[PDB]
Design a protein around this motif. Structure first.
Motif, PDB file in Angstrom:
ATOM      1  N   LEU A 363       0.825  -1.164   0.000  1.00  0.00           N
ATOM      2  CA  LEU A 363       0.000   0.000   0.000  1.00  0.00           C
ATOM      3  C   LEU A 363       0.902   1.273   0.000  1.00  0.00           C
ATOM      4  CD1 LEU A 363      -2.713   1.299   0.050  1.00  0.00           C
ATOM      5  CD2 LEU A 363      -2.698   0.881   2.550  1.00  0.00           C
ATOM      6  N   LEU A 370       1.735   6.591  -6.872  1.00  0.00           N
ATOM      7  CA  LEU A 370       0.683   7.514  -7.234  1.00  0.00           C
ATOM      8  C   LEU A 370       1.122   8.976  -7.026  1.00  0.00           C
ATOM      9  CD1 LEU A 370      -2.090   8.201  -8.224  1.00  0.00           C
ATOM     10  CD2 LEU A 370      -2.963   7.738  -5.971  1.00  0.00           C
ATOM     11  N   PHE A 519       1.579  12.056   5.776  1.00  0.00           N
ATOM     12  CA  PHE A 519       0.660  11.041   5.296  1.00  0.00           C
ATOM     13  C   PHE A 519       1.282   9.642   5.293  1.00  0.00           C
ATOM     14  CE2 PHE A 519      -1.171   8.414   1.943  1.00  0.00           C
ATOM     15  CZ  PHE A 519      -2.439   8.192   2.511  1.00  0.00           C
TER      16      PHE A 519
ATOM     17  N   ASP B 362     -10.235   7.514   9.066  1.00  0.00           N
ATOM     18  CA  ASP B 362      -9.409   8.717   9.093  1.00  0.00           C
ATOM     19  C   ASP B 362      -8.226   8.773   8.125  1.00  0.00           C
ATOM     20  OD1 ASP B 362     -11.046   9.883  11.029  1.00  0.00           O
ATOM     21  OD2 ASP B 362      -9.757   9.137  12.651  1.00  0.00           O
ATOM     22  N   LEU B 363      -7.565   7.642   7.958  1.00  0.00           N
ATOM     23  CA  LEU B 363      -6.508   7.562   7.003  1.00  0.00           C
ATOM     24  C   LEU B 363      -7.066   7.899   5.585  1.00  0.00           C
ATOM     25  CD1 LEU B 363      -3.637   7.003   6.301  1.00  0.00           C
ATOM     26  CD2 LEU B 363      -4.268   4.547   6.333  1.00  0.00           C
ATOM     27  N   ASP B 366      -7.726  11.520   5.253  1.00  0.00           N
ATOM     28  CA  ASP B 366      -6.389  12.170   4.986  1.00  0.00           C
ATOM     29  C   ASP B 366      -5.903  11.980   3.566  1.00  0.00           C
ATOM     30  OD1 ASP B 366      -6.324  13.008   7.625  1.00  0.00           O
ATOM     31  OD2 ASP B 366      -5.045  11.382   8.302  1.00  0.00           O
ATOM     32  N   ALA B 367      -5.973  10.762   3.066  1.00  0.00           N
ATOM     33  CA  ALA B 367      -5.608  10.512   1.660  1.00  0.00           C
ATOM     34  C   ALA B 367      -6.359  11.483   0.710  1.00  0.00           C
ATOM     35  CB  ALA B 367      -5.838   9.040   1.273  1.00  0.00           C
ATOM     36  N   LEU B 370      -5.182  15.260   1.287  1.00  0.00           N
ATOM     37  CA  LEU B 370      -3.890  15.452   0.667  1.00  0.00           C
ATOM     38  C   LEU B 370      -4.007  15.497  -0.869  1.00  0.00           C
ATOM     39  CD1 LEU B 370      -0.891  15.825   0.724  1.00  0.00           C
ATOM     40  CD2 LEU B 370      -0.638  13.395   1.019  1.00  0.00           C
ATOM     41  N   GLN B 371      -4.872  14.656  -1.453  1.00  0.00           N
ATOM     42  CA  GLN B 371      -4.958  14.582  -2.891  1.00  0.00           C
ATOM     43  C   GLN B 371      -5.539  15.884  -3.535  1.00  0.00           C
ATOM     44  OE1 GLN B 371      -4.151  12.166  -6.273  1.00  0.00           O
ATOM     45  NE2 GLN B 371      -3.585  12.080  -4.065  1.00  0.00           N
ATOM     46  N   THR B 373      -5.615  19.091  -1.804  1.00  0.00           N
ATOM     47  CA  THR B 373      -5.126  20.315  -1.161  1.00  0.00           C
ATOM     48  C   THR B 373      -3.871  20.805  -1.858  1.00  0.00           C
ATOM     49  OG1 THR B 373      -6.029  19.752   0.998  1.00  0.00           O
ATOM     50  CG2 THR B 373      -4.258  21.351   0.948  1.00  0.00           C
ATOM     51  N   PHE B 515      -6.724   7.581  -8.265  1.00  0.00           N
ATOM     52  CA  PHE B 515      -6.878   7.701  -6.852  1.00  0.00           C
ATOM     53  C   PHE B 515      -8.238   7.132  -6.364  1.00  0.00           C
ATOM     54  CE2 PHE B 515      -8.663   9.864  -3.268  1.00  0.00           C
ATOM     55  CZ  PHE B 515      -7.660   9.670  -2.302  1.00  0.00           C
ATOM     56  N   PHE B 519      -6.369   3.526  -5.838  1.00  0.00           N
ATOM     57  CA  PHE B 519      -5.635   3.675  -4.595  1.00  0.00           C
ATOM     58  C   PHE B 519      -6.554   3.687  -3.370  1.00  0.00           C
ATOM     59  CE2 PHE B 519      -3.820   6.230  -1.179  1.00  0.00           C
ATOM     60  CZ  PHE B 519      -2.786   5.361  -0.785  1.00  0.00           C
ATOM     61  N   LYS B 522      -8.177   0.325  -2.429  1.00  0.00           N
ATOM     62  CA  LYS B 522      -7.089  -0.445  -1.770  1.00  0.00           C
ATOM     63  C   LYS B 522      -6.766   0.040  -0.324  1.00  0.00           C
ATOM     64  CE  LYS B 522      -2.591  -2.556  -2.714  1.00  0.00           C
ATOM     65  NZ  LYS B 522      -1.600  -2.959  -3.781  1.00  0.00           N
ATOM     66  N   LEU B 523      -6.661   1.351  -0.117  1.00  0.00           N
ATOM     67  CA  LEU B 523      -6.376   1.895   1.193  1.00  0.00           C
ATOM     68  C   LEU B 523      -7.408   1.434   2.278  1.00  0.00           C
ATOM     69  CD1 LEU B 523      -4.270   3.633   2.246  1.00  0.00           C
ATOM     70  CD2 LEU B 523      -5.548   5.628   2.053  1.00  0.00           C
ATOM     71  N   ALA B 526      -7.349  -2.322   3.258  1.00  0.00           N
ATOM     72  CA  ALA B 526      -6.196  -2.769   4.013  1.00  0.00           C
ATOM     73  C   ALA B 526      -6.342  -2.309   5.435  1.00  0.00           C
ATOM     74  CB  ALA B 526      -4.870  -2.237   3.392  1.00  0.00           C
ATOM     75  N   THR B 527      -6.872  -1.098   5.607  1.00  0.00           N
ATOM     76  CA  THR B 527      -7.171  -0.514   6.926  1.00  0.00           C
ATOM     77  C   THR B 527      -8.648  -0.747   7.317  1.00  0.00           C
ATOM     78  OG1 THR B 527      -7.499   1.689   5.853  1.00  0.00           O
ATOM     79  CG2 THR B 527      -5.383   1.278   6.851  1.00  0.00           C
TER      80      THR B 527
END
Lengths: 527, 527
Positions: A363, A370, A519, B362-363, B366-367, B370-371, B373, B515, B519, B522-523, B526-527
């Motif tokens: 990941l 990415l 991050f 939360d992760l 954040d992803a 960030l993508q 901002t 994304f 991505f 997948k994120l 996993a979490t």
């Protein structure tokens, strides 16, 4: 005599050296510790017993035992970094350049060499202090320290190989300057330590470490910072690598005493020959024997030290080069070569990211990919090569340094930030590598001033500026006598350093460094 | 008589309607199913018993029972979407516009309205088929379907409220066109279904569903696709929401039979009044009663259907608008208002991202942040407002649609892709909202041709082009008679749709959609 100096360790005899059609004094090869040989291998250094008579300080000393880069035999781009004297474990000496006539109390600058904590020499041509000492009228010191296993083998708990002993060498040298620079005309109350790469991380480590803070006034960090992911290891990881090293040499691994004994019987080159075998990952930008978070030199984790302000508060000047990663990709990533343009396939790109972030799960590797892929043009060879270059630079140098500066700036008493982006006109490394890691040093030391070295007139001008900034900062805590703005928590200003008229910018690589500093670490913590 | 048509359900009497200074026939309010009332509420539709006599098809029928937007009472921007006839559960009727004189076998186009599966009317002014039927010489059908609970309440296993019954309404209408359009001059072998938003997702659902594939030839999808995250729910989630709905109405929840009985006694508005209370998250772009993956209408998950090519292979034309999210942020996110420029703080931005991605940890939040901002300018009000607009559009419309097109294109027989970016000159919604979700429909239906509606001459030109593209595509499987390129797996070309000379581009929003489609999923896995 101008070349005779009576210090607290004994008298020392220098040598008059020519410099840009004038002359200065050089005291080369002054010992500052007992030779770290025999039973003293891996030990803390020991101060040098004073000597009677006159120490002959007219020649460069030995370089520490170190791995020797033979990637491009004969090529000057790589060989200029290789030791240029005999290597020896008897290597703990410093070098002093003193204006002529001898000053009474001037700014002192102490240079701490890089080389990934596994290599480096105080005696390199690009480190010749005579241009800066002469031009800026500073007393210039360059110290030395044990590298590789000799400097950094760590068996926490044992007193025979505690770890960090290479950092204690640097500290003993800073102790000898404190105590003796006055006899050379230097002001021991106005010492700046500066260093590049592991030298910059070292400088940041002496700011952090309580037992070093008192021995210098200010600090310059070039392309390195103490919290870099390659600059230190846990005691447990240090332990695992010292054991693995002994495994490579068929040591008795029953006790630390057995291990350490066996390692002390081996010739230097035996250690050097298997030194890269202990790395835990297939990686790039990782060095086997590095500083350990021991609870002594570093009381707590670097991060908790940075959060609480447990660090010397003073002024700092620091920065990075544009293309910090290219050297490590060259030497270690598939698809990059010295004599091509090194356009990278997607297959090599993904191979490169895995090597650059060895500690990442899949990941995490996707998050990186990415973040650095242009999905409109993902088979662009150049964009893949450059994006890998930035990954390496960002993760390893720029974003660690950006984290240090931001944290430090909260408690410090003035921060000056630069981004060095001039590619030297006479650079022998290929174009693709850009503004290469390490290639600001020759500007810092004033090589563009010597005609025979083939720089442009505007390179000479840039050198003179950089030197004047570094030495004025060393003297006053401010590079300024056009104006380089202070870096502040709010505005976060920095200057570019190049042959063009100054430009001030803000938030150096923030997009990427939020990713590396906030991050991704969160991502790998959760997964 | 031109206005009399004998169909298999009985005779029908139309009405002659004026259109751009000419005339055509309109057969409005044809019933195609038995009224879904009483014990038939939540049931599969039932075909309409043929009638003797002449069905009077000269007026628009009732609109289905639906929530009614009262956000801007009197404002035409919102009210143009509200039902314009009496609502009734007796609402299952279609509308036909037939060129004059009556064609013998022409292209048929069947319009499927949007409205998030909770609202919508076939009888809206912007859906008036007379401009397109007249201009393009097509037979234009608009059908209707049950929305909200009435259309989509799902208690899997029971036959009284199976779920998906609103999709079966659309299917019965497509069945009635198949069987009867020939008597109106339409070719039942050349039907295109088209629809916007839930209408576009519906169209994609009839491509997926084995029991619908055979009833049309080709498909147009506007700002929607079947795999949109708001367009369907598991049987378990459908079940949980039908139970919660009954909880809101104090139903006996002992059995499905008890629940369903209790829900069938309630007046339509009682259901409508508590309908939003069943959503599992505080969210934006989520609708309570939507299609369920039931294992019948949809044999397997939409994704495994898309991977295996389990879907009608034909030509498709589809696309999105520039600013798909602005409407949902307006109505539902803090800091956005109709009469300001809606510059968003960071605090509101982060509130907006949480609402837009309710299903994220939360992760994941954040992803996203960030993508979208710009960390060089993170307090820019405009950049925050627009970045939220893109988040909503991308996640909910564009990237789902981009995934559908890529998967579909592997097995389909021709894909035409557009990006609609003209903001109508007479738009009553504020500037900040841009090219708003839904505002390409009036170009598709040819409203810019009626002088009194106050479009520019170049808007009329664009309308005429869009219509000619849609109708030529419907007729031949190709919008072209300058040239709109085929979308292919390799090149991934698309055209912009605006008053400017055509521009072809490639990979619509790939950076963002990798994304959202690769991505982030997948994120969160996993979490």
């Amino acid at each position: 005599s101008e070349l005779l100096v009576n210090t607290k360790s004994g008298k020392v005899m220098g040598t008059r050296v020519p410099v840009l059609s004038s002359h200065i004094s050089a005291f080369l090869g002054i010992p500052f510790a007992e030779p770290p040989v025999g039973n003293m291998r891996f030990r803390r250094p020991e101060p040098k017993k004073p000597w009677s008579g006159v120490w002959n300080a007219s020649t460069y000393p030995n370089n520490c035992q170190q791995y020797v880069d033979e990637q491009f035999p004969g090529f000057s781009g790589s060989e200029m970094w290789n030791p240029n004297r005999e290597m020896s474990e008897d290597c703990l000496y410093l070098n002093i350049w003193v204006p002529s006539p001898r000053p009474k109390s001037t700014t002192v600058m102490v240079w701490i060499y890089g080389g990934g904590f596994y290599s480096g020499s105080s005696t390199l041509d690009v480190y010749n202090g005579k241009y800066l000492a002469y031009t800026e009228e500073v007393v210039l010191v360059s110290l030395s320290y044990r590298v590789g296993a000799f400097g950094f083998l760590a068996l926490h708990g044992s007193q025979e190989a505690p770890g960090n002993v290479g950092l204690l060498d640097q500290r003993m040298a800073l102790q000898w300057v404190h105590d003796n620079i006055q006899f050379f005309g230097g002001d021991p109350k106005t010492v700046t330590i500066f260093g590049e790469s592991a030298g910059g991380a070292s400088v940041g480590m002496h700011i952090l470490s309580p037992g070093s803070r008192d021995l210098f006034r200010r600090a310059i960090l070039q392309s390195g910072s103490p919290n870099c992911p390659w600059a230190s290891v846990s005691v447990a990881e240090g332990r695992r690598r010292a054991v693995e090293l002994g495994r490579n040499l068929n040591c008795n691994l029953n006790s630390d005493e057995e291990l350490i004994h066996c390692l002390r019987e081996k010739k230097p080159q035996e250690l050097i020959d298997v030194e890269w075998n202990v790395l835990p990952f297939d990686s790039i930008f990782r060095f086997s024997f590095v500083p350990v978070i021991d609870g002594e030199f570093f009381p707590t984790s670097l991060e908790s030290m940075l959060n609480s302000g447990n660090f010397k508060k003073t002024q700092i000047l620091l920065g990075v080069n544009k293309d910090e990663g290219s050297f490590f990709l060259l030497y270690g990533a598939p698809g990059f070569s010295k004599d091509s343009e090194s356009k990278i396939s997607r297959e090599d790109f993904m191979s490169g990211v895995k090597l650059s972030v060895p500690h990442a799960n899949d990941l995490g590797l996707d998050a990186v990919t990415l973040q650095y892929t242009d999905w409109m043009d993902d088979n662009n060879g150049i964009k893949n090569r450059d994006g890998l270059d930035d990954i390496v630079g960002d993760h390893n140098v720029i974003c660690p340094l950006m984290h240090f500066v931001n944290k430090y700036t909260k408690f410090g008493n003035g921060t000056y930030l630069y981004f060095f982006n001039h590619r030297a006109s006479n650079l022998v490394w290929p174009e693709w590598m850009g503004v290469i890691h390490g290639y600001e040093i020759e500007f810092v030391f004033g090589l563009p001033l010597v005609k025979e070295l083939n720089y442009t007139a505007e390179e000479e001008a840039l050198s003179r500026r950089i030197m004047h900034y570094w030495a004025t900062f060393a003297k006053t805590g401010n590079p300024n006598e056009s104006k380089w703005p202070l870096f502040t928590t709010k505005e976060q200003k920095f200057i570019d350093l190049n042959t063009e008229p100054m430009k001030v910018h803000q938030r150096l690589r923030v997009q990427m460094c939020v990713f590396w500093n906030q991050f991704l670490p969160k991502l790998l913590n959760a997964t």
